[PDB]
Amino acid sequence: IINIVEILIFLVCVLFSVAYLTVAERKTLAYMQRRLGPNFVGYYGLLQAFADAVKLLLXXXXXXXXXXXXXXXXXXXXXXXXXXXXXXXXXXXXXXXXXXXXXXXXXXXXXXXXXXXXXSLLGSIRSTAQLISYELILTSIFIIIIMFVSSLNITTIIXXXXXXXXXXXXXXXXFIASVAETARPPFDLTESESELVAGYFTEXXXXXXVFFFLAEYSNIILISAFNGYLLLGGXXXXXXXXXXXXXXXXXXXXXXXXXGLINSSAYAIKLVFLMFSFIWVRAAXXXXXXDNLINFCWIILLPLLFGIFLIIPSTLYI
Amino acid sequence: MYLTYYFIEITIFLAILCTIFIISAKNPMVSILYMIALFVIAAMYLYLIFSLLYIMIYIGAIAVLFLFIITLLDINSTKSNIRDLPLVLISLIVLTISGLMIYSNDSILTLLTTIGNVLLTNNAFILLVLAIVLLLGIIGPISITMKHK
Amino acid sequence: FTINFGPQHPAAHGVLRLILELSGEXXXXXXXXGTEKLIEYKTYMQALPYFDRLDYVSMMTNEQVFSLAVEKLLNVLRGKYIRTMFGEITRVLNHLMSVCSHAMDVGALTPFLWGFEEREKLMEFYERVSYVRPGGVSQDLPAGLLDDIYMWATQFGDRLDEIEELLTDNRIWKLRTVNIGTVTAQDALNLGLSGPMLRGSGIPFDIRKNAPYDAYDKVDFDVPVMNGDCYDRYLIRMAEFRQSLRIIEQCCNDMPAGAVKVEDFKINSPPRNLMKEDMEALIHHFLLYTKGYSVPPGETYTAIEAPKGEMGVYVVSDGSERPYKCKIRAPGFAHLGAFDHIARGHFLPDAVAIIGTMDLVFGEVD
Amino acid sequence: KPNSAVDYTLTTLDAVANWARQGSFWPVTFGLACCAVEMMHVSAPRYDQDRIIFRASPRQSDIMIVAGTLTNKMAPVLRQVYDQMPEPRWVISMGSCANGHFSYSVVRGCDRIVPVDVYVPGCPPTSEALMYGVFQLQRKMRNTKIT
Amino acid sequence: MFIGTIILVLSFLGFVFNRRNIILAFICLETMLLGINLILLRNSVLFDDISGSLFAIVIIILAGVESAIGLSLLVSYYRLRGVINSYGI
Ligand code: SF4
Ligand code: SF4
Ligand code: SF4
Numbered sequence A: 001i002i003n004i005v006e007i008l009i010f011l012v013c014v015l016f017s018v019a020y021l022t023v024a025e026r027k028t029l030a031y032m033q034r035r036l037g038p039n040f041v042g043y044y045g046l047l048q049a050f051a052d053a054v055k056l057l058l059x060x061x062x063x064x065x066x067x068x069x070x071x072x073x074x075x076x077x078x079x080x081x082x083x084x085x086x087x088x089x090x091x092x093x094x095x096x097x098x099x100x101x102x103x104x105x106x107x108x109x110x111x112x113x114x115x116x117x118x119x120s121l122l123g124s125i126r127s128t129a130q131l132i133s134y135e136l137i138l139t140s141i142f143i144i145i146i147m148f149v150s151s152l153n154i155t156t157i158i159x160x161x162x163x164x165x166x167x168x169x170x171x172x173x174x175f176i177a178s179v180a181e182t183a184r185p186p187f188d189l190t191e192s193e194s195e196l197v198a199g200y201f202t203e204x205x206x207x208x209x210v211f212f213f214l215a216e217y218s219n220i221i222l223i224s225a226f227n228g229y230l231l232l233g234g235x236x237x238x239x240x241x242x243x244x245x246x247x248x249x250x251x252x253x254x255x256x257x258x259x260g261l262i263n264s265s266a267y268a269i270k271l272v273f274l275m276f277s278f279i280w281v282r283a284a285x286x287x288x289x290x291d292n293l294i295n296f297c298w299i300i301l302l303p304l305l306f307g308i309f310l311i312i313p314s315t316l317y318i
Numbered sequence B: 001m002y003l004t005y006y007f008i009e010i011t012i013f014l015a016i017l018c019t020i021f022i023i024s025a026k027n028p029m030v031s032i033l034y035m036i037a038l039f040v041i042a043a044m045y046l047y048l049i050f051s052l053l054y055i056m057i058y059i060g061a062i063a064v065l066f067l068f069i070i071t072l073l074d075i076n077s078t079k080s081n082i083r084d085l086p087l088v089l090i091s092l093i094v095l096t097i098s099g100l101m102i103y104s105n106d107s108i109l110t111l112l113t114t115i116g117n118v119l120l121t122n123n124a125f126i127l128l129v130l131a132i133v134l135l136l137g138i139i140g141p142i143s144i145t146m147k148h149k
Numbered sequence C: 001f002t003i004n005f006g007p008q009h010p011a012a013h014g015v016l017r018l019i020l021e022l023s024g025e026x027x028x029x030x031x032x033x034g035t036e037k038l039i040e041y042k043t044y045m046q047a048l049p050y051f052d053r054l055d056y057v058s059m060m061t062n063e064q065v066f067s068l069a070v071e072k073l074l075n076v077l078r079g080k081y082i083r084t085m086f087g088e089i090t091r092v093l094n095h096l097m098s099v100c101s102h103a104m105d106v107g108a109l110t111p112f113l114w115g116f117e118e119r120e121k122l123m124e125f126y127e128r129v130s131y132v133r134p135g136g137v138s139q140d141l142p143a144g145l146l147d148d149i150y151m152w153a154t155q156f157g158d159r160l161d162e163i164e165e166l167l168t169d170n171r172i173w174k175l176r177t178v179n180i181g182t183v184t185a186q187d188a189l190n191l192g193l194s195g196p197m198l199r200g201s202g203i204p205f206d207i208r209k210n211a212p213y214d215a216y217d218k219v220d221f222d223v224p225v226m227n228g229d230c231y232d233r234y235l236i237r238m239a240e241f242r243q244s245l246r247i248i249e250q251c252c253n254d255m256p257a258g259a260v261k262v263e264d265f266k267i268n269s270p271p272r273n274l275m276k277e278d279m280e281a282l283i284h285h286f287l288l289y290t291k292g293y294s295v296p297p298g299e300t301y302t303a304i305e306a307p308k309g310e311m312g313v314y315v316v317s318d319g320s321e322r323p324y325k326c327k328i329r330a331p332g333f334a335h336l337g338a339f340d341h342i343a344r345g346h347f348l349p350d351a352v353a354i355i356g357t358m359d360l361v362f363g364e365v366d
Numbered sequence D: 001k002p003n004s005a006v007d008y009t010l011t012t013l014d015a016v017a018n019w020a021r022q023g024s025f026w027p028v029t030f031g032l033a034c035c036a037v038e039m040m041h042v043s044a045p046r047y048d049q050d051r052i053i054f055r056a057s058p059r060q061s062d063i064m065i066v067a068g069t070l071t072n073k074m075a076p077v078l079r080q081v082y083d084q085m086p087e088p089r090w091v092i093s094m095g096s097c098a099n100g101h102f103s104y105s106v107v108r109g110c111d112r113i114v115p116v117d118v119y120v121p122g123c124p125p126t127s128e129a130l131m132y133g134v135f136q137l138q139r140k141m142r143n144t145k146i147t
Numbered sequence E: 001m002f003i004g005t006i007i008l009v010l011s012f013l014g015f016v017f018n019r020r021n022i023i024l025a026f027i028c029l030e031t032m033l034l035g036i037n038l039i040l041l042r043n044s045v046l047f048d049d050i051s052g053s054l055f056a057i058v059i060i061i062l063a064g065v066e067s068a069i070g071l072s073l074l075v076s077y078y079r080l081r082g083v084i085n086s087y088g089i
Helices: A003-032 A050-057 A074-090 A097-107 A109-114 A118-149 A154-160 A169-181 A185-190 A209-216 A218-230 A238-243 A246-250 A259-284 A291-309 B003-007 B010-024 B028-047 B050-070 B085-107 B116-122 B124-142 C035-040 C047-051 C059-074 C080-105 C111-129 C146-154 C159-168 C172-177 C185-190 C230-253 C280-290 C331-336 C350-356 D012-024 D034-043 D075-083 D127-141 E002-015 E025-047 E053-076
Strands: C002-005 C018-021 C027-029 C298-306 C309-317 C325-329 D027-031 D063-067 D090-094 D118-120
Touching (some): A003 A050, A003 A074, A003 A209, A003 A259, A074 A209, A074 A218, A097 A109, A097 A118, A097 A154, A097 A218, A097 B050, A109 A118, A118 A169, A118 A218, A118 B050, A169 A185, A169 A218, A169 A259, A185 A259, A218 A259, B010 B028, B010 E002, B028 B050, B050 E053, B116 B124, B116 E053, B124 E053, C035 C325, C047 C059, C059 C080, C080 C111, C080 C159, C080 C350, C111 C146, C111 C159, C146 C230, C159 C230, C172 C230, C172 C350, C309 C331, D012 D127, D034 D090, D034 D127, D063 D075, D118 D127, E002 E025, E025 E053
Parallel strands (some): D027 D063, D090 D118
Antiparallel strands (some): C018 C027, C298 C309, C309 C325
8 A cells, every 4th residue: 555655666676677787797798808788779778678678578479398388487487486585675574584595495496397308308407406506505504694693584684794794704705606606607508508409598489588587687686685685794884883873874964864775875785796796707707517516516515514514503602 | 354364264275176186187297386386375374484494395395306306207107807806895885884774773673483492402312313314315315326336 | 319519509600510429428420511623613813712711710821821832833031921920810810719719618708809809900910911822922011010010919918818817727617628628649640630639639740840831940939738638729729829929029020121922924923013014914914814824734732730730732733724623631620530539428518618629610621 | 652651650659669679689690601700700899789699599589690601401401590580580691602602512692592681792791891781680670771 | 284184185085096197196195294284283383382393394304305215216216228137037
């Protein structure tokens, strides 16, 4: 009623950012390569997101390889799952961190479904497995941060964090190595394309691709944001909050404004930086060779975090 | 007030249907999807945390395993005396009753649900056995599907 | 149960019908589908425009080879320096393309962009000139030849190292290349595996050294050298880039005033300004461009090292205006016969990496 | 043709999508010989044209760029890729070979198998000439094209 | 508990009548386990505190193990490629 405007604005914003992020990765990487991304489509280059996503729907294109309507259904679920993860950020939810875990459990289901040609489907099973490995990793980390906290509500963790990515720097580094491994350098190579299959990404077909990439970047902004609340600085100049930051707020006057903004601008800055890391990790990047990613996580990253569980409570009971 | 909430016995109505649909479905994949939806209805019934536990584990892993197994393993599927034989035993079921009605005529003309307290503590014998039970789970296949030299 | 590799975008271009039989990690059953005939019906001068068409990236290696063999059959300095400069320039252009292509094929884009900027500097040096001829060359360079190569040779040695800076300290590329791409040196020789693909595997036989051609004898070149793999073939070509740049520097220095093509009127044709004073030059000019020249009756085959392997023209001349039969010893075809052996039992994503390391171009193969 | 037709000049809706189409146009790279090498110089110089890879499916792209020699054996494959492309599709013939060195192993023209929207001569044509062909396809999608 | 009981029943019915299939079975069993868990959960809430909630969680853990065991059993059965032994079975 009143909540309808509060939800609307937020989601319109989220979607706006998701759409623009495509153009962001473009421009950023072009700067690295000594080139320019979307030069015209603007002014600025703002209208490359819209005029492109508008052009895939207009194409409006189906093979028995994926069941009739189950062929254009994984496209719906990938976006529908991404929709929930952003909406579960705004709301408080009394048991919030295992509500975030329910959605990234349920997201992957669309990969096992996506292809269900014999061999292409076999290729889908690989990515299905690949995602499953790091999704277990992140849980191990969520759990470590809950060990330090104990309160499952996301908010308590967001508010608790005069330090966050100081003790957990190694963990966060491993978070980004997994957070990207769930979708960027490996998944770019995990796509495989042998042969054609699946062009740039999962046989796009038009205009299911519009909701796919709007679950990709969307679940990269939310995937990095999530990392931010757990591990990174989830709002404010803490050194100032320690040094008596109130000075600027108490001497500001009164309006009940800009105080709510400061934090959002800080988190915006965090996700911006994490996204930039994602921009360069896609640039610097090399191979993935699926078996050479299974070996990396199961045999190494997974038992590394395991040994950490055999330190957190021991040093807590020390 | 809030009549829709009152009518949410709609869960049972849905469930009966959703399971009658897991049976009807040809073939397995659709039925897997169905088991997911049925489990989701179960979760929706837990708002009436076990939803989030059920969604993270059952739908999260089990279902993923059933979908990952069906797509990996080809398997599939869609009176010869022994086949007639079970039905033969049911006609005896009717007879018991028919014999009985004629028998009676003999004389006639902070913290959020927690669980940790009892698991880690009182039932720690069980928690320890559950670490051992999970041991087998991973080991069993590694001694059922391995074929090592 | 197979993977039909391609059928247009395998990872770059080609075309490809590499019917790769598979079982997880098996039997490369390729299909590489009349230049050989067209060349027969074409004069020696006419076959020059056809020559560069085979290996488009290192076209000049094709030009030099053909022109050389035709020179030997016919028996025809400041022109030979221009070739050494241009052969190596086309080797830098052809080495850039391959390093990047393979860096793109399995792994990420980034290096490829950088590869192309320096390429754009060479194509500019290619638009400025046009070039090679059976007598010598089409025409002279320019006064803006000397000072321009230096600006490219200065802003290259650094750039050559950034590409290397990223690859030498190979992230996934080490795990993906190091063991993959089995090339036994004995078996490479048995499969007639051309090289730079052969020299990484250990064997030190290169045409530029074994059989030096025009001005390559007088220029100071280094010893590029462990175990026949993708990684070491990939890195040797990166060293080859710097040594090529040192040849370019060494050849830019040794460039005085000189003529460009062989003065024997029966071959070449360098009048251009003399068309207005000589009668023998027009009777000759008209005749060379109509009929052409008839070479001696006999066989000839002069090999030249291309960056894509072993280039050689087998030209049989029956005293005609055209070559009786021109069979081009295909470096990319020779290298490809070792794919069914090298990629046997290798991975499918690595089967793309194993192909980029071979340094193939379909135009040369077919 | 017709000028400022209907009750009120709108017209607007079609041109809105067409303008959006022409500048966001999705090219499907069909690399054959040398022409594919010049077409890569094109990507190094591309900013708005940028879309290649959509070439791999090929059901994701609209602009079919045939660059290089079309062998007579390659002829039935090039036919099936254009047919396996989505409905609003355009075709760019790059190179003397794809337009019209005529041999006994190559198709005399690419138009023989697939209908050609824009022709770009050269051997290979300069990157900017393909950009000019891209603009010849841009102004064509805009309904601009005529005599 | 009303819901879970009905679900259990259905699951059992689908178990036998088998419906010939043999593939459905594991799904059906997992469903049965869920159904029971539902019944107990309602009873736990009816009773109050860590009485049934724990056993519930256990069956969940145990259910996970059962699906692992069953799935590896399937992977074991269904031997790959067409190579023959010689008269022994
Ligand atoms: S000689 Fe002239 S006509 Fe022939 S190709 Fe060269 S350019 Fe065309
Ligand atoms: S072609 Fe012969 S006759 Fe004709 S003018 Fe020339 S040289 Fe003399
Ligand atoms: S047109 Fe010239 S450029 Fe394209 S393939 Fe033909 S020969 Fe090469």
